[PDB]
Amino acid sequence: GVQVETISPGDGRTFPKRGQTCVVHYTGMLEDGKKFDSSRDRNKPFKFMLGKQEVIRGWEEGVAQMSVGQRAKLTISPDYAYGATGHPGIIPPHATLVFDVELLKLE
Ligand SMILES: CCC(C)(C)C(=O)C(=O)N1CCCC[C@H]1C(=O)O[C@H](CCc1ccccc1)c1ccccc1
Numbered sequence: 717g718v719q720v721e722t723i724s725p726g727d728g729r730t731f732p733k734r735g736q737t738c739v740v741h742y743t744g745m746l747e748d749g750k751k752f753d754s755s756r757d758r759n760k761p762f763k764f765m766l767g768k769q770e771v772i773r774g775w776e777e778g779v780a781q782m783s784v785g786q787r788a789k790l791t792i793s794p795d796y797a798y799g800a801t802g803h804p805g806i807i808p809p810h811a812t813l814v815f816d817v818e819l820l821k822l823e
Pocket residue numbers: 742744752753754762770771772773775797798803806807
């Protein structure tokens with residue numbers, strides 16, 4: 717599954733809905749702390765639409781639990797991420813992923 721652990725609270729009332737665009741900042745890490753990517757290093761938020769099937773399943777499920785303004789750590793099991801394939805060259809097979817995600821805005 718995905719485990720959502722809060723870093724900073726959101727407004728507690730504006731949660732993303734299917735068809736909305738979530739504007740997030742993120743840093744993705746492996747369980748040992750190794751960063752594999754971060755939009756914070758590019759200083760440009762990442763956008764995805766909820767329910768469109770264009771991000772990994774632990775994101776659709778985890779970010780839907782977040783209210784605008786919230787910063788949380790999402791621990792995502794491999795079956796909710798890249799499974800046995802992994803992402804060629806970046807994520808190994810069977811990897812648990814840890815994302816530090818801040819939900820900035822809904823568009
Ligand atoms: C940018 C890619 C990477 C590995 C550096 C990364 O940090 C990542 O895992 N991310 C990107 C930010 C959203 C979460 C996740 C993802 O859904 O990627 C999608 C994965 C596509 C997909 C979805 C489901 C099952 C398999 C593959 C992604 C988005 C954009 C570009 C490439 C991958």
